[PDB]
Amino acid sequence: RSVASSKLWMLEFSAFLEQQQDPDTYNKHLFVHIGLEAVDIRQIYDKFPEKKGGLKDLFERGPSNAFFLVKFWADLNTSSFYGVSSQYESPENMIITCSTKVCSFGKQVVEKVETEYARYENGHYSYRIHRSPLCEYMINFIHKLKHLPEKYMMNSVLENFTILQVVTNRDTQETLLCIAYVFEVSASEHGAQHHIFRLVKE
C-alpha cells in the first residue's frame, strides 16, 4: 500500500531485460522491482525540471498526498527486449496519463507518455502499462554504466540522474501520483533493493 495517494495506488513497477535464447525459451533479468519515512521535497528540487509544470509547481498544486520519492538499488548484473511494466489500482474509473521524464542534471532529456484506460476488478479499477519499450537513451545509458570498472564510478554518474513519473487524470488534470526516482547500483547478495519515502512540504 506504500506508493498510493487517495485516488491511485501503484502496486507493481519493474524494469527488465528479456532475452530470447530460442522461440520457446526466455530469460528475464530485473534491474529494479517494486511488488513510511518523510523527506522534505525542497531537498530534491534542483534535481528535476523546475519550469512551469515542474516538480515544485506540481507539488504546490497538490494534492500533497500524491508525491513520493523512491530510492532504487539497481541490479545491473547480467533477441533482446528492454521493458518497463507497472500496475495501478483506483476506486475511480478514469482516463489516466502517465508521463515519465528522464533527467540529467535536472534537465529533461527524454519523455515518454502513455494513456491508459480502466478495467473493472473486484469493485475497483485496475490500470496496466505492460511491457512498455525502454527508450534508446536508457538502453545506452545502462550499457555505458555496465562497462565501468568500478561500482563507485557508477554511483558518481547516477548522482545527477533522476526519473520523474507523473500520473494524471486526463479529464480533471488532477495529479494522481508523482514519483521521483533516485538510483544507485546494488552490491548485495539479494540483488535489486528499494526504499519508498513520502515527499512533504517541510
Binding site: 523527506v39 545506452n140 533493493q193
Partner: protein, 34 residues
C-alpha cells in the same frame, strides 16, 4: 546533442558541481539498503 554529453560524462569519471545527496537532509535508510 545528449549522446555526446553522455560520452563526455563517462570519460570524465574515468579520467578525473552541486551539493551531493550524501550531504543533504535525507534519512539514513536513503543511503543504506534493507
Amino acid at each position: 546533442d545528449s549522446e555526446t554529453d553522455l560520452e563526455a560524462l563517462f570519460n570524465a569519471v574515468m579520467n578525473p558541481q552541486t551539493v551531493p545527496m550524501r550531504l543533504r537532509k535525507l534519512p539514513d535508510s536513503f543511503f543504506k539498503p534493507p
